Design an enzyme around this catalytic site. Structure first.
Site, PDB file in Angstrom:
ATOM      1  N   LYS A   1     -46.837  -9.750  -3.463  1.00 43.16           N
ATOM      2  CA  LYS A   1     -46.176  -8.520  -3.042  1.00 43.16           C
ATOM      3  C   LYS A   1     -47.107  -7.310  -3.098  1.00 43.16           C
ATOM      4  O   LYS A   1     -46.858  -6.313  -2.393  1.00 43.16           O
ATOM      5  CB  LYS A   1     -44.944  -8.236  -3.903  1.00 43.16           C
ATOM      6  CG  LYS A   1     -43.879  -9.289  -3.760  1.00 43.16           C
ATOM      7  CD  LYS A   1     -42.714  -9.097  -4.777  1.00 43.16           C
ATOM      8  CE  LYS A   1     -41.533 -10.059  -4.596  1.00 43.16           C
ATOM      9  NZ  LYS A   1     -41.842 -11.469  -4.928  1.00 43.16           N
TER      10      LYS A   1
ATOM     11  N   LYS B   1     -48.061  -6.271 -12.667  1.00 44.73           N
ATOM     12  CA  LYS B   1     -47.185  -7.168 -11.927  1.00 44.73           C
ATOM     13  C   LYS B   1     -47.382  -8.593 -12.415  1.00 44.73           C
ATOM     14  O   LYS B   1     -48.518  -9.066 -12.517  1.00 44.73           O
ATOM     15  CB  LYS B   1     -47.481  -7.101 -10.417  1.00 44.73           C
ATOM     16  CG  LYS B   1     -46.495  -7.891  -9.563  1.00 44.73           C
ATOM     17  CD  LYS B   1     -45.174  -7.188  -9.445  1.00 44.73           C
ATOM     18  CE  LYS B   1     -44.128  -8.102  -8.770  1.00 44.73           C
ATOM     19  NZ  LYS B   1     -43.572  -9.025  -9.831  1.00 44.73           N
TER      20      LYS B   1
ATOM     21  N   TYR C   1     -34.131  -7.079  -7.333  1.00 41.98           N
ATOM     22  CA  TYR C   1     -35.428  -7.656  -6.983  1.00 41.98           C
ATOM     23  C   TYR C   1     -35.225  -8.815  -6.000  1.00 41.98           C
ATOM     24  O   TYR C   1     -34.373  -9.694  -6.218  1.00 41.98           O
ATOM     25  CB  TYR C   1     -36.083  -8.125  -8.282  1.00 41.98           C
ATOM     26  CG  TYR C   1     -37.486  -8.658  -8.148  1.00 41.98           C
ATOM     27  CD1 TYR C   1     -38.491  -7.922  -7.539  1.00 41.98           C
ATOM     28  CD2 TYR C   1     -37.815  -9.897  -8.663  1.00 41.98           C
ATOM     29  CE1 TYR C   1     -39.798  -8.428  -7.445  1.00 41.98           C
ATOM     30  CE2 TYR C   1     -39.108 -10.397  -8.582  1.00 41.98           C
ATOM     31  CZ  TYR C   1     -40.070  -9.644  -7.977  1.00 41.98           C
ATOM     32  OH  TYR C   1     -41.347 -10.164  -7.923  1.00 41.98           O
TER      33      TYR C   1
ATOM     34  N   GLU D   1     -45.311  -2.285 -10.362  1.00 37.84           N
ATOM     35  CA  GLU D   1     -44.471  -1.603 -11.333  1.00 37.84           C
ATOM     36  C   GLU D   1     -45.350  -0.611 -12.065  1.00 37.84           C
ATOM     37  O   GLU D   1     -46.499  -0.911 -12.395  1.00 37.84           O
ATOM     38  CB  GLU D   1     -43.876  -2.607 -12.321  1.00 37.84           C
ATOM     39  CG  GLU D   1     -42.967  -3.591 -11.635  1.00 37.84           C
ATOM     40  CD  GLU D   1     -42.672  -4.830 -12.480  1.00 37.84           C
ATOM     41  OE1 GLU D   1     -43.025  -4.845 -13.676  1.00 37.84           O
ATOM     42  OE2 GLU D   1     -42.097  -5.789 -11.949  1.00 37.84           O
TER      43      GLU D   1
ATOM     44  N   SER E   1     -45.261 -15.801 -10.313  1.00 39.80           N
ATOM     45  CA  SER E   1     -45.122 -17.209 -10.651  1.00 39.80           C
ATOM     46  C   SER E   1     -44.787 -17.977  -9.383  1.00 39.80           C
ATOM     47  O   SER E   1     -44.041 -17.502  -8.505  1.00 39.80           O
ATOM     48  CB  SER E   1     -44.031 -17.466 -11.686  1.00 39.80           C
ATOM     49  OG  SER E   1     -44.350 -16.883 -12.927  1.00 39.80           O
TER      50      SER E   1
ATOM     51  N   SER F   1     -45.417 -13.784  -7.000  1.00 36.91           N
ATOM     52  CA  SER F   1     -45.005 -12.439  -6.639  1.00 36.91           C
ATOM     53  C   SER F   1     -46.127 -11.403  -6.703  1.00 36.91           C
ATOM     54  O   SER F   1     -45.929 -10.294  -6.192  1.00 36.91           O
ATOM     55  CB  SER F   1     -43.865 -11.961  -7.543  1.00 36.91           C
ATOM     56  OG  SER F   1     -42.717 -12.785  -7.331  1.00 36.91           O
TER      57      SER F   1
HETATM   58  B1  LIG Z   1     -42.174 -13.492  -8.474  1.00 38.75           B
HETATM   59  O1  LIG Z   1     -43.186 -14.184  -9.174  1.00 38.75           O
HETATM   60  O2  LIG Z   1     -41.601 -12.483  -9.226  1.00 38.75           O
HETATM   61  C1  LIG Z   1     -41.038 -14.426  -7.799  1.00 38.75           C
HETATM   62  C2  LIG Z   1     -39.706 -14.439  -8.560  1.00 38.75           C
HETATM   63  N1  LIG Z   1     -39.911 -15.244  -9.721  1.00 38.75           N
HETATM   64  C3  LIG Z   1     -40.095 -14.860 -11.028  1.00 38.75           C
HETATM   65  C4  LIG Z   1     -40.235 -16.025 -11.747  1.00 38.75           C
HETATM   66  C5  LIG Z   1     -40.469 -16.187 -13.235  1.00 38.75           C
HETATM   67  O3  LIG Z   1     -40.217 -15.206 -13.986  1.00 38.75           O
HETATM   68  O4  LIG Z   1     -40.931 -17.287 -13.668  1.00 38.75           O
HETATM   69  N2  LIG Z   1     -40.130 -17.091 -10.904  1.00 38.75           N
HETATM   70  N3  LIG Z   1     -39.892 -16.598  -9.643  1.00 38.75           N
HETATM   71  N4  LIG Z   1     -41.617 -15.734  -7.521  1.00 38.75           N
HETATM   72  C6  LIG Z   1     -41.050 -16.583  -6.557  1.00 38.75           C
HETATM   73  O5  LIG Z   1     -40.035 -16.294  -5.951  1.00 38.75           O
HETATM   74  C7  LIG Z   1     -41.775 -17.879  -6.386  1.00 38.75           C
HETATM   75  S1  LIG Z   1     -40.845 -18.787  -5.191  1.00 38.75           S
HETATM   76  C8  LIG Z   1     -41.827 -20.243  -5.210  1.00 38.75           C
HETATM   77  N5  LIG Z   1     -42.339 -20.869  -6.294  1.00 38.75           N
HETATM   78  N6  LIG Z   1     -43.065 -21.977  -5.877  1.00 38.75           N
HETATM   79  C9  LIG Z   1     -43.123 -22.171  -4.600  1.00 38.75           C
HETATM   80  N7  LIG Z   1     -43.843 -23.240  -4.005  1.00 38.75           N
HETATM   81  S2  LIG Z   1     -42.242 -20.996  -3.674  1.00 38.75           S
END
Ligand SMILES: *[B]([O])([O])[C]([C]N1[C]=C(C([O])=O)N=N1)[N]C(=O)[C]SC1=NN=C([N])S1
Length: 355
Positions: A62, A308, A145, A268, A311, A59
């Site tokens: 973003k 920010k 989110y 953020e 993951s 993320s």
């Molecule tokens: B982002 O990093 O905020 C978002 C949502 N998210 C948060 C967490 C956490 O707190 O561990 N995990 N996800 N990240 C994603 O949506 C990653 S989606 C994918 N992850 N691996 C891929 N190959 S696609």
């Protein structure tokens, strides 16, 4: 104190605690970039994690989407008042065409969850998803989110620039920021620098990629030197040419608040000094996973800091910067570790090198 000592004390123990193969930590202070590497890019190859290692930003991607949106907005290519159907014509006369671009970029459409449904993969399936969308909560009033939300923002930005999103970043935004090894699609010539990350069981992990539009939510790959440069750009935008300076600064403006967190574009934002608990609360299950009613901004904090987390299945990222102290920090790992550990370790380091 010495940066290496503080990073050794606060970040290095996390590799043993979480069995992380490799970690890259960068600190920028007074426009000088310090890089520290621990462990391995590839366990099997005994290849040291290094300044060429490519990590998935999750993320933190973003922040690049936000910068692209700020770049387009300040060149008149979009208005944050626009709705998506002005640019994606197949969305005209649909309910989602009642949501403006700022609301999509800041997660307030009122009915978009964290992820696309698993079955939404092709461009047609994404279009059908948005054509079939209907409102739930009052538009603009609740933050949830959302990767589809900022994905649609990024798609509109790309349409407004007459280039696909990967090219917006790789041909316009990354070069304007002086980034040399940042990618949406890593080329074969970089294969030796981009290994799979590691799941919780220390296995190299891959999954099938999701819809292309979600690359604006979680699909950027970069290196520690490039991320330090990106933090430098956020700390010192006047060193950069005017179009990208305007784009960077656009990402710093708070758009509404939820408790002690102000939602900027991508970033953020918090009043500085911020307590550790304020920074931790920003990544709480309540804020990340649930809808929360927003409060309009009357007074933006005069002294601010920004962070920010990011993951992916195989990688962890955290970035933070504090303009008043002219300092920032980047952590990249090839295995996830809990967000709280990332935030706490960065807090301990930056609190001790304040000046
Ligand atoms: B982002 O990093 O905020 C978002 C949502 N998210 C948060 C967490 C956490 O707190 O561990 N995990 N996800 N990240 C994603 O949506 C990653 S989606 C994918 N992850 N691996 C891929 N190959 S696609």
């Amino acid at each position: 104190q010495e940066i290496k000592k503080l990073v050794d004390q606060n970040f290095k123990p996390l590799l043993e605690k979480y069995d992380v193969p490799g970690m890259a930590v960068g600190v920028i202070q007074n426009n000088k970039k310090y890089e520290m590497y621990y462990g391995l890019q590839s366990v099997q190859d005994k290849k040291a994690v290094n300044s060429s290692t490519i990590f998935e930003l999750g993320s933190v991607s973003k922040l690049f989407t936000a910068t692209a949106g700020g770049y387009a907005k300040n060149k008149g290519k979009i208005s944050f008042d626009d709705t998506p159907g002005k640019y994606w014509k197949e969305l005209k006369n649909t309910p989602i065409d009642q949501v403006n671009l700022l609301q999509l970029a800041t997660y307030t459409s009122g009915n978009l969850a964290l992820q696309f449904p698993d079955e939404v993969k092709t461009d047609q399936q994404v279009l059908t998803f948005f054509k079939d969308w209907k409102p739930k909560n009052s538009i603009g009033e609740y933050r949830q989110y959302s990767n589809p939300s900022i994905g649609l923002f990024g798609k509109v930005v790309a349409l407004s620039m007459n280039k696909p999103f990967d090219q917006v970043l790789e041909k316009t935004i990354f070069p304007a920021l002086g980034l040399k090894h940042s990618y949406v699609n890593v080329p074969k010539t970089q294969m030796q620098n981009y290994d799979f990350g590691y799941n919780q069981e220390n296995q190299p992990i891959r999954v099938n990629p999701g819809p292309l539009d979600a690359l604006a939510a979680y699909g950027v790959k970069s290196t520690l030197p490039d991320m330090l440069s990106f933090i430098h750009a956020n700390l010192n935008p006047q060193k950069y040419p005017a179009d990208i300076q305007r784009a960077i600064n656009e990402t710093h403006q708070g758009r509404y608040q939820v408790n002690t967190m102000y939602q900027a574009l991508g970033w953020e934002e918090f009043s500085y000094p911020a307590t550790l608990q304020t920074l931790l609360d920003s990544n709480s299950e309540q804020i990340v996973m649930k809808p929360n009613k927003v409060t309009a901004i009357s007074k933006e904090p005069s002294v601010k800091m920004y962070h920010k987390t990011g993951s992916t299945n195989g990688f962890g990222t955290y970035v933070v910067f504090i303009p008043k102290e002219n300092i920032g920090l980047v952590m990249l790992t090839n295995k996830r570790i809990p967000n709280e550990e990332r935030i706490k370790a960065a807090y301990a380091v930056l609190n001790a090198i304040k000046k």
